[PDB]
Amino acid sequence: MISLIAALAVDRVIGMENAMPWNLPADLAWFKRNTLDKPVIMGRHTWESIGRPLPGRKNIILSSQPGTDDRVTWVKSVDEAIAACGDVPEIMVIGGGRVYEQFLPKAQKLYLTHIDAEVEGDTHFPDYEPDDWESVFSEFHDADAQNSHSYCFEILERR
Ligand SMILES: NC(=O)c1ccc[n+]([C@@H]2O[C@H](COP(=O)([O-])OP(=O)(O)OC[C@H]3O[C@@H](n4cnc5c(N)ncnc54)[C@H](OP(=O)(O)O)[C@@H]3O)[C@@H](O)[C@H]2O)c1
């Protein structure tokens, strides 16, 4: 099955000028936890934003153009991206905006972090129909010395 994982600020903002402006180490730890040892699918802009392969994961990059780095797998379509994952229980789609839009209709699970921060951004998580999704896990955390905003981890399953 296909899952999406994302961190959303207020108004579903996920990025600004090809970057993620906040720093929330608790949330990056959650991301690592939930993606380690799974294939991760990302768009080319997100690959450039991360800037290097994610270790311990098969990194699959969607681009219409040929690949420029053989440390990762390059594919030209959604169907090719899925096929390159092989027969695994869970495929993690890690964005960005355009890639999330394409995989949302196929996804069975959403791993969402809601961050209490207002960021003037240019990229948004897709508008999802809330009736289609059941919350199966929710955990709220106040800000602390390491994490300057409060945040909520949620896992939603398609009903
Ligand atoms: N907060 C979060 O959870 C989170 C997560 C991920 C990313 N982000 C942010 O999101 C932003 C990047 O998002 P974005 O929407 O601009 O870009 P994106 O979705 O990362 O990448 C878009 C690119 O991927 C390729 N692509 C997408 N679908 C394709 C298809 N079906 N076939 C072939 N190629 C395809 C194209 O590359 P070519 O142009 O090479 O064809 C396209 O230009 C950044 O600000 C990043 O920091 C935030």
Ligand SMILES: Nc1nc(=O)c2nc(CNc3ccc(C(=O)N[C@@H](CCC(=O)O)C(=O)O)cc3)cnc2[nH]1
């Ligand atoms: N919940 C969530 N938070 C995010 O920040 C996030 N970011 C992306 C895309 N961008 C990034 C940027 C950096 C790293 C990163 O450096 N991760 C290391 C963290 C090591 C750690 O903090 O433990 C990794 O190994 O996963 C991952 C994804 C996709 N989904 C997300 N999902």
